Amino acid sequence: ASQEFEVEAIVDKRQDKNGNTQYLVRWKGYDKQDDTWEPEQHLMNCEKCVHDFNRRQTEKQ
Protein backbone atom coordinates (compact mmCIF):
# COMPACT_ATOMS: atom_id res chain seq x y z
CA ALA A 1 0.00 0.00 0.00
CA SER A 2 1.55 3.36 -1.19
CA GLN A 3 0.41 5.13 2.00
CA GLU A 4 1.26 2.19 4.33
CA PHE A 5 4.43 3.10 6.13
CA GLU A 6 6.44 1.33 8.81
CA VAL A 7 5.59 2.42 12.38
CA GLU A 8 8.39 2.99 14.92
CA ALA A 9 5.93 3.30 17.83
CA ILE A 10 2.51 4.58 18.84
CA VAL A 11 3.31 7.12 21.58
CA ASP A 12 -0.15 8.62 22.54
CA LYS A 13 -3.85 8.02 22.02
CA ARG A 14 -7.10 9.99 22.28
CA GLN A 15 -10.87 9.45 21.85
CA ASP A 16 -12.96 11.23 19.18
CA LYS A 17 -16.59 12.30 19.90
CA ASN A 18 -17.81 8.93 18.38
CA GLY A 19 -15.84 7.06 21.12
CA ASN A 20 -13.32 5.81 18.54
CA THR A 21 -9.54 5.97 19.07
CA GLN A 22 -6.83 7.99 17.32
CA TYR A 23 -3.16 7.13 17.73
CA LEU A 24 -0.11 9.36 17.65
CA VAL A 25 2.25 7.54 15.23
CA ARG A 26 6.05 7.92 15.16
CA TRP A 27 7.04 6.81 11.61
CA LYS A 28 10.18 4.63 11.16
CA GLY A 29 12.99 6.67 9.53
CA TYR A 30 11.22 10.06 10.07
CA ASP A 31 11.73 12.74 12.75
CA LYS A 32 9.32 13.93 15.47
CA GLN A 33 8.19 16.81 13.26
CA ASP A 34 6.68 14.15 10.90
CA ASP A 35 4.52 12.38 13.53
CA THR A 36 0.81 12.18 12.68
CA TRP A 37 -2.43 11.49 14.51
CA GLU A 38 -4.10 8.59 12.76
CA PRO A 39 -7.63 7.21 13.10
CA GLU A 40 -7.78 3.66 14.44
CA GLN A 41 -8.81 2.19 11.04
CA HIS A 42 -5.33 3.19 9.73
CA LEU A 43 -3.75 0.75 12.26
CA MET A 44 -5.40 -2.41 10.86
CA ASN A 45 -1.94 -3.68 9.64
CA CYS A 46 -0.34 -2.57 13.07
CA GLU A 47 -2.23 -4.81 15.73
CA LYS A 48 1.22 -5.34 17.47
CA CYS A 49 1.85 -1.50 17.56
CA VAL A 50 -1.43 -1.09 19.51
CA HIS A 51 -0.78 -4.09 21.84
CA ASP A 52 2.78 -2.69 22.48
CA PHE A 53 1.45 0.85 23.24
CA ASN A 54 -1.16 -0.76 25.62
CA ARG A 55 1.59 -2.80 27.42
CA ARG A 56 3.88 0.32 27.76
CA GLN A 57 0.90 2.14 29.51
CA THR A 58 1.52 -0.35 32.44
CA GLU A 59 5.38 0.16 32.70
CA LYS A 60 7.73 3.08 33.79
CA GLN A 61 10.23 5.18 31.65
Binding site: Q3, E6, V7, W27, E38, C46, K48, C49
Partner: peptide, 11 residues
Protein backbone atom coordinates in the same frame (compact mmCIF):
# COMPACT_ATOMS: atom_id res chain seq x y z
CA UNK B 1 12.54 -1.70 6.84
CA UNK B 2 13.02 -3.02 10.48
CA UNK B 3 9.52 -4.70 11.05
CA UNK B 4 6.33 -5.77 9.12
CA UNK B 5 4.30 -3.30 11.43
CA UNK B 6 2.69 -0.71 8.99
CA UNK B 7 -0.15 1.84 9.12
CA UNK B 8 -1.83 4.19 6.65
CA UNK B 9 -0.47 7.69 6.95
CA UNK B 10 -2.72 10.73 6.54
CA UNK B 11 -1.37 13.20 3.90
Amino acid sequence: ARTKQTARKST
